[PDB]
Amino acid sequence: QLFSKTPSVTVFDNRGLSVRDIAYRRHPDTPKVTEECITYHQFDFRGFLAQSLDPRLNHKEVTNFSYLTDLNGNIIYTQSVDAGNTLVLNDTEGRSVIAMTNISRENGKDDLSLAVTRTFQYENAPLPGRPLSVTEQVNGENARITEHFVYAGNTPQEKNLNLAGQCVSYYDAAGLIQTDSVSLTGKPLSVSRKLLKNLDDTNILADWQGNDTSAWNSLLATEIYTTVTRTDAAGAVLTTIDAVGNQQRVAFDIAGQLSASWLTLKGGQEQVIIKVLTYSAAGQKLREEGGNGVVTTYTYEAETQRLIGIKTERPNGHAAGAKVLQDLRYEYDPVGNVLSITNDAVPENAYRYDSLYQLVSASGREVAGAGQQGSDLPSPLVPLPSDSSVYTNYTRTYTYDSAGNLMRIRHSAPATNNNYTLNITVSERSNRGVMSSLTENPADVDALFTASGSQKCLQQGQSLIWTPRGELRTVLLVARGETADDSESYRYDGSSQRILKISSQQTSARVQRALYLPGLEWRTMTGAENLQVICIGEAQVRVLHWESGKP
Amino acid sequence: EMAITTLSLPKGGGAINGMGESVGQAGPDGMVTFSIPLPFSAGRGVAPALSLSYSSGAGNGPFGMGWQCSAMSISRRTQKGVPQYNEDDEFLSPSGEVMAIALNDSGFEDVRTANRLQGIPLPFSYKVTRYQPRLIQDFIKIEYWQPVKQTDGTPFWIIYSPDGQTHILGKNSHSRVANAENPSQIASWLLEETVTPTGEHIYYQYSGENQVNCTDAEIALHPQDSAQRYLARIDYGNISPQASLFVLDEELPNLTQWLFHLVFDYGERDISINKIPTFEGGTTGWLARPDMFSRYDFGIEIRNRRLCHQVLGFHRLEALNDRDVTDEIPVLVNRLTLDYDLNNSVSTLVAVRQVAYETDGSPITQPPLEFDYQRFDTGSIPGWQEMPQLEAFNGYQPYQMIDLYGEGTPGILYQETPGAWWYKSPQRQIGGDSNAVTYGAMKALPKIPRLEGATLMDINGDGRLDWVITSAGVRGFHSIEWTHFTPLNTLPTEYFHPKAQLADLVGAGLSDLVLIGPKSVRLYANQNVSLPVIGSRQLVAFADMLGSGQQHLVEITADSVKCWPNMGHGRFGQPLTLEGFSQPQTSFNPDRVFLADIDGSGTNDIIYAHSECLEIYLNESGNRFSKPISLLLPDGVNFDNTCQLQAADIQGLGIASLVMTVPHMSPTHWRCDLALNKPWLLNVMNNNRGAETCLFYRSSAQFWLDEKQLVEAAGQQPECHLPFPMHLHWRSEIFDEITGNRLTQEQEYAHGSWDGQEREFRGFGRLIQRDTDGFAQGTVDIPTHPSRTVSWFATGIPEIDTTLSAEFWRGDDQAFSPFSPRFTRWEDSEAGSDVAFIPSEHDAFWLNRAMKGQLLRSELYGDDGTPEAEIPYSVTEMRHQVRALPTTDATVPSAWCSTIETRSYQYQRVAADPQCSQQVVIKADRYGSPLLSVAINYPRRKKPEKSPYPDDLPETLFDSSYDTQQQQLHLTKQQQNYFHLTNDDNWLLGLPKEQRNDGYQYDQERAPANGFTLETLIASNSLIGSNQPFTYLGQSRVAYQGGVDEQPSLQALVAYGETAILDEKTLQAFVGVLDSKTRDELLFSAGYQLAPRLFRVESEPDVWVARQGYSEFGDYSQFWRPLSQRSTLLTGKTTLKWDKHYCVVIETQDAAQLVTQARYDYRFLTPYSLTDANDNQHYVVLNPFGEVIASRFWGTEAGKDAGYSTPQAKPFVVPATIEAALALSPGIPVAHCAIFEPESWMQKLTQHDVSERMADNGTLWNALLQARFVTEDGYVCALGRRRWMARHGLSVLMLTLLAEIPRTPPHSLTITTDRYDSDDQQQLRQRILFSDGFGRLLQSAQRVEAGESWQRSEDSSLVVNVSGTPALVVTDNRWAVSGRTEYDGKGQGIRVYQPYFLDDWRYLSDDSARTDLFADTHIYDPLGREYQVITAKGYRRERQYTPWFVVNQDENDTAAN
Ligand SMILES: [K+]
Ligand SMILES: [K+]
Ligand SMILES: [K+]
């Protein structure tokens, strides 16, 4: 009813180009008011995209995006109000050769004072021009070679391991990944990670100079983290032995779908994680029984294949008694927005959306009185509630602008009087926005970000440091000038995936380390707990194995 | 971009299609065409590209009525006079166009002397003359090669194709059709050899007609029989590379020097699939067809006795595998069998089928492609019915049913006073059947003159004396005027000035001429060997008794029928006897003999009238007569000399009906129509995979009556330009036997054009086509409405073409005025240009003719009853230019037609605000290549005061749909040049050279009110002129090697391609970021380089370009094959190593020394084995159709061997049936194996079952097999079944049996193994892919774990309880069915089903699916665009297309309300 005359419209020029995206925003509270939201796209003399403007900023004469291309429409230069200005270029082989980022402006011209220049180097002729190295250079600083690739040859030794033409050695920001063995099906059977020495010091950075692996291996810590895989004839992974020797095993059904999984801790016997798993005709999980005897049953809508039921239960005849642990029931609008959720064990979450399918109202329950939502988790309610009066109902309202920026979350918990409003202050010349506690002035929001658009302050006393690639480097939790700070740092692999997390708190010093490996989290706590977290599935089931400090 | 060669095993399997056969799109000629590409190998790449093709306008031949499978040829002109083998003879291009001796560039007759050709010295001297056709299509170069000394040898033809190919026609006697009495008198030169710049050859060997398997009577009747040729064998994949034609050598290469053969069998081999055809023919000799026929177009007899029964592919596998060639016999690869409905009148091609062979010799078959035709049926002859249209006549009043005006349908000619002749034109009867004919108001004949006993007269008029009038006379003692009217075309051309035998026949001249049928005329006289004497109890007449297309001489007595062949120019040949006709000498009366084509065979049949009976003797292909058909008169009628009877095509169908008037009998007027449709026309196709197309013809004459009715109702005057009936593609019904859905395509024709001056069919001026969906559901659940496309084509006649634009839709007052044809003269000294001119009347005839068949306009409508239904979705119109080209003929210019302008409007059924684009070819070179062209995008029209779009939209959308970018006039200029190699005796045109594009943008105010034309664009004040500012868009260049500099040689080897990336304007992307030096060294490092700007003006700066696509090639001895490839110079080369005869590449080595090796199955030249860069083996097994039916792989892992057992170690036999394959046990040494079942839609029938049901010990089985009701391997053929039923019926026992027998859509089974065969945990995954009769993916079934599913019955429906609810069962034979789709006739997914479980892999019926399974329905518009979706839940999504915006409404948007 709220959606009458709210279509999506695309408006064209005379050369088949989409120059306008038109939406129609209508709030259920004010169903007589319909906002026509228009996104503008301007194309140049060559038929390529030159400018894009959201409905909000267009009114204020600011351009969300500007592009400058080559004669074929490939973007070379970009101006973003959110991501700042950037410059990229590819070669004649289609390979990326340069990317300059974190550029702003002010004085009119582009500010390169903090520009990050990443360049890509490839094998030269007569080689097939495979990726050779990746160099990263921040303005005013020295260039670091952050990546290097080494490829195997044609020797019988290499062929027997199926390594010919494969990148056998990958030096990234964290250290080294070696590919030891490849399946007949072209899959890796053995990979080994070595860490760069002293990654605990945030000032030590990878820099693979030259073309000698001997000189590099000396920079690596001694430990070798080897993950071993065994795949089936169709190239699917059957067994996995992690770096500490635990095995995950899977089995597939006649249709090749995961049908069972097992775990064999090092020195232990094989045990069931997933006993049986059935699927719908559409290949969606239907019934899943685990090693704990617990059964999850998924209910789907026949017309739409939408998930309308999730039932986790201890079934009849279970050793610990039959009990429905969770029974989620979903009700959707014709388009597929979640209108309501129920759980059997009366509790109900109701949802209202605008004509753009933005969530404007949400009802639910919380342990009241919690207090105003922040970065913290609530204190855990221990033990498990027997009575539900321990919960109170809340209603939240959400307020968005023309560019989809969430400006307001109004929390209303009347009975316990736990009422508050989280305000987000949005810039008037970008989509940059921060909580009002940082600033309530739109004109000061952009300074709180980098030129790339990465936030520099999390909360009031908390600052954010970023890598040249725009990866989160350090969260400064409690600053103490000089020089003992509560902080948490991060490290990433060449694919920008997190490999290491180091938290530090003053008490000598509580240091919590997290090493992320295939199917494994290696977490140490000092100031000593040595925890190995086996991750099963892809992560669904987790196993906590202490080598030391089991509470 | 250049493709880099990568060795891979055939990675496919699943889908099932056919040979790529297709019905032709309906065109302005109205003919039904069909085409089947020959399913044989392309060899190295140079191969015969033959298609077996059908045309409803074609005659009989070596592939049956209407079919042909021939290569290019050059013949003498016959259509405007019979050739006499003198210098006045004319020659036709392979396109059928008349040629003239061409002029050279110096302005003289292009004649030369030659003693050398292609570097090969000729034994003697030749006079070489260049010929040029009146219409240029492909700029081919045609040379006539005549020995200077006539006795030195025979002449032949050379055709240089613009692709650099050279073709020689009729060099030796097998490739020449020549006079049986004088081999020098050549009628036709057939293609004999083709050579390409790569030194690859194709040789065409023909067999001459002979007396093998002919009866003695046939031999006696046709001694001159050696003329005709039949395609016998095609040799390709020549082992020796040679740039020059082999026919120029002293001797042709041995037969062993061709890797590939295509053999044509004419019956000498066993037709059985159980007998494998050998490369060697004989000694049984080719069979003689029952319907032998002669043609006499060339003034010589050509006898035709042979039919092609098999087409065969042969490879020299030993030679291709580089094994010992000694005593090699080429092996059969693919076999195409052809079934004919053999008939003494007309034999029809009724089936083509692929058959191939396993190593064990077992036949593996494809489903047959079947055809059937409209047939004359004596049992379905309509009886007599009264003819009320003659009610006004007393019953003694004489009349003649004749097409007086030339409308294709005869009207009523009579004498009213007497002395006064009046005519009633045929007209569409009102209210009656769609083809019912009445006759309009009388109209006075012009003053009839009457003199030399017979005089000419113009009636229509035309200015053409089209009518020969005679008068009966005179006996006895009776004073008396009653005349006879005879169409001039029923007489030999040389009737009034007879020479030879005609003069010997007529003498002083004939006394009288009396029509005895539509095109047969009885002769009445004054009072070598061996003409009849006109004036006994005999009949002498002119009639086509031979079906050859001429008015022959015929004598009929009580016991004889003799025919003398009209050989042209007054010459008549030796008499032919046609047995079969007899009447007692005591009752035989010549007056009671009528000559007409009754069965539409082409031959004139005999109709003899008795007092109570009419006997009809069908003419069997001019050889004899059938046993007579007895037509009883209506009860009470006794035919005598006071009664009136005539044979006339009163239906306008090209076949004679009978009009009888019997006084003293009421009613007095009677009709007998013997057929309602023209027989021998293809009307059904079925591929036995689920697709059937039914065809429907309608005469051009009926169409003319309808058109004339509409014209007369519109106050205008009807003018017919089509004087005879043509059978036009009227309707196609495309039927999906699996879903039961149909698509109807309907055609209407108007403005029919036949040219009297050149005696030539020009075609139709307007063609309207309706497309209507017809769903088996038979509800309105998919509410589609028919689409309508109105198209206008040029006829080449101004009197017709000038009236077409008036019919154009005029609902858009702002639309630009219609295009007009542009005529130019060519000025190539030395770049060339077209100069517009107004041709003389005489020149205008030919230059206008050049526009024959060109599409002028097209409008697309949706007939959905909406208010906007009369406004087209889109309109497209074209402007054509004819370049006049002078030859040695001073009176006929040669011509080249091209589409110089195209304009498209997108209205989307809103007349006021369309989009408009226009493409214009401004300059073309001497060979038709575009030099200067422009694409134009017009601005949007000015915003109106009110919205022309629905008020269902938001009220602001109209205003907000306007954007300034819609107001900018865009013109995109495109320049290009070419390399043309025409020096010496080579001919290679249109080689890519340079191209450049520039942009022009203007304000709406500068847009011309009447729009752009070519003249507007070459004008000095052009918007794209040299003065105007522009935006450089880029350029492209091709550089060649070896090669003068970077220019091409005949081999056209590309060195690299070079395209512009950056110029001074785009370089501004670097400004605030990098300085010039840094930018330049970056670009240089990234592989870019500076090159001159092409088509440079005013010192334009060089542009940064990218060069890609580098190849190194071998020499002539390696057939110029690529030896190395690389994308740019930034990387290393990949090396190619070819096999022995350079057919395929067997090894690649990239730039890191990685080596990939392949081994090929040489019956398909596809790889079957692959060794990868890590020395791993990959292996496939191919079935006899090149399909992968098993695959495995092995090699090493961690030193140890893995995983699948080698074929040597553990052979695997793929189960012969799916039932067996499903029942396989683990431990199979294959990763995949496949079973293909493309014939599963044909019901399976065994000899045993039929014989057990009929208890006839095999009788019915043997008969059904013989007629191909069923194939030898036991598949029931659809059309064979229908034909059989139509001729013999079928026992109810067989009906019962067949009802017990299930069908299943064409499908494939693919089994995929989980582990290597050494692993006992191995599972066999099972996936079955379904295809429909159109090659579309029907559904996919995957074997899943046991569980709950619906239950499929044997009848393919769902098992439901009594109430109708589907049963739910638990089974271990459960399948997950995904992607189930119900298509319409256009291949669009009308129903996409949710996945479902079933207790069988077999196809669940569409009835049960539509009733019980959830699906989203998709509704498409006439443009094939989805505009509505009804979800299973019942919600709707809609999409509205307007020229300037698309509106999208989802489930929420439409739910209200
Ligand atoms: K909406
Ligand atoms: K290997
Ligand atoms: K006939």
UniProtKB/Swiss-Prot annotation, chain A:
It is found in: Secreted. The keyword Translocase does not apply. Keywords: Autocatalytic cleavage, Repeat, Secreted, Virulence. Disruption phenotype: A double yenC1-yenC2 deletion is no longer pathogenic in C.zealandica larvae. The keyword Secreted applies. RHS repeats lie at residues 164-178, 293-307, 325-339, 346-360, 393-407, 485-499. It comes from the Bacteria. GO terms for cellular component: extracellular region. Residues 610-690 form a beta-strand plug which closes one end of the shell; the other end of the shell is closed by the 5-bladed beta-propeller domain in YenB. Part of an orally active toxin complex (TC) with strong insecticidal effects on larvae of the Coleoptera Costelytra zealandica, Acrossidius tasmania and Adoryphorus couloni and some Lepidoptera larvae. The TC has an endochitinase activity. This is Toxin subunit YenC2.
Curated annotation (Swiss-Prot), chain B:
Its main location: secreted. Keywords: Secreted, Virulence. Pfam families: SpvB (PF03534), TcdB_toxin_midC (PF12255), TcdB_toxin_midN (PF12256). Residues 22-373 are annotated as: SpvB-like domain. One of its GO terms (cellular component) is cytoplasm. Residues 384-672 are annotated as: 5-bladed beta-propeller domain. InterPro entries: Integrin_alpha_N, Sal_SpvB, TcdB_toxin_mid/C, TcdB_toxin_mid/N. Disruption phenotype: Cells with a disrupted yenA1-yenA2-chi2-yenB-yenC1-yenC2 locus are no longer pathogenic in C.zealandica larvae. In the N-terminal section; belongs to the SpvB family. Residues 389-698 form a 5-bladed beta-propeller domain which closes one end of the shell; the other end of the shell is closed by the RHS repeat-associated core domain in YenC2. This is Toxin subunit YenB. The lineage of its organism: Bacteria, Pseudomonadati, Pseudomonadota, Gammaproteobacteria, Enterobacterales.
